[PDB]
Design a protein around this ligand. Sequence first.
Ligand SMILES: O=C(O)c1sc(-c2ccccc2)cc1N1C(=O)CC[C@@H]1C1CCCCC1
Length: 561
Amino acid sequence: ASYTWTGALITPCAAEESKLPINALSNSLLRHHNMVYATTSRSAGLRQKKVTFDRLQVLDDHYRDVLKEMKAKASTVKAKLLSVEEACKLTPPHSAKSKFGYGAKDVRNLSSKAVNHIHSVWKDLLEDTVTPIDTTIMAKNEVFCVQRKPARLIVFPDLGVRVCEKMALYDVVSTLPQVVMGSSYGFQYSPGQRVEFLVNTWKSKKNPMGFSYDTRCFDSTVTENDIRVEESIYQCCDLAPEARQAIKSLTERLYIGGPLTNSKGQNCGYRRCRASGVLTTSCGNTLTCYLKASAACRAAKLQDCTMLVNGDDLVVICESAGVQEDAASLRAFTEAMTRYSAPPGDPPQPEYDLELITSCSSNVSVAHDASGKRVYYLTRDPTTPLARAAWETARHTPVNSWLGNIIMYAPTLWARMILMTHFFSILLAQEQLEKALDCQIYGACYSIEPLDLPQIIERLHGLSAFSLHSYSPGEINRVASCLRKLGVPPLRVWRHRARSVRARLLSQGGRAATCGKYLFNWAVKTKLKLFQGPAASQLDLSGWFVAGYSGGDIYHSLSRA
Ligand SMILES: O=C(O)c1sc(-c2ccccc2)cc1N1C(=O)CC[C@@H]1C1CCCCC1
């Protein structure tokens, strides 16, 4: 059973905002504020019913053939332990405080109280490889639009354990998946690299067929054998005997399961599946999903199939054998996945147009550059990104989703017209363009200076990201519908706001004038010629798009010279 419950409630640790706070700045983004809600602990019971069930898992020679192949590639990886200090510097500054009298700032500053407790948690992992470690169960406060959705749940150990996880497994979860999975590992790609992989893979098939597979409650479908199988993959690496012991221990004491404690210290129940807030959530889920999907591909006898995995998110592109044969092949793949304990949520179906395949809430779309050439870029429905941006305008947040969206979806119609214009306008008026903001890229937290956005966008997306026009009608209709749905002003209100912001930025010189020139070139009557090359101070963007760290509690720093 994925979970058992004591009856104790999942409790909030503070007052939870449920509805969007009206603001004379929030209303300039969207009028219809009633459409925007935030999930709360009051819907935890609805989530608990969904995530609670018995698993049925039947492994076969296909699963075993794939596992052995993965284990072979895993054996070529050498991973080193991090020092207490290396692991302390990887902690986000607003990471949950320890129950042992210290917090993220104390960990990041290497306080004797933190460090000495971190040494003791570590010594216990080496001496006890059995006693379940305590975890906290919370309900996530995530902002959405109505179409009404229950709070997703977060399970995580204490700050001391989290630093110990980094020490034992940061090098593994950063290095291992790409070696084992190759081109199928999604987090090695920037949005543009993902699109390149998808478009080239589609173009490589005589008769392309594609599909996304949605596993219903993937974390709940992850059985204790699944977590023992990931550890056996981790143990295939060239590791020091101390890392091996800490990895074995972290597995049996934490990753396979353990007791759930609410915010007021009451025992909620017991977990026997994936913890969403441990270092290995991303890596483990990616390995497990790729393993199950790769073996199901063989069971289904799918022809020349290529898959792209990002945690629980899977997309498979193969050679179509006709609509009838493809539906039957997909029944075979779904039946195999079900046996491996990965049954579908939304049932999969073949698709014969790459724009119509959604994976990672995203799809490949097409636009034209300044020279009129076709440019494939990654887009998504802008509802959730826009609703979150409205919430971030009204109420202060530690992590700014609008900036991570501007970075990942920079070539898109909606990020450029709305998000860039809105937040550069706010930052100008507030005199805070220089101030670095915290945001997430593939789960990891980064402190990014907004004045560096033309340089960031150019490196990840290309100079075309500033000249894209003639977007597909399907993209336009989805964006247009969303503006009409949420009460977002039309293009003409955004072009005046953009021209005004552009003039104001150019008058300031420096990095500000670069933002004006580059970001808002779409606003002016006749676009200026833009040329490629580096900026006066080039950031180190190599650590970005290496691995996924969602739930991992990872914080990355930016170099420059
Ligand atoms: O060229 C286009 O296909 C479109 S479709 C569209 C549109 C569709 C529905 C609602 C609102 C806007 C606008 C454009 N664009 C133009 O007027 C010229 C380039 C620009 C986009 C470029 C990206 C930043 C914002 C403006």
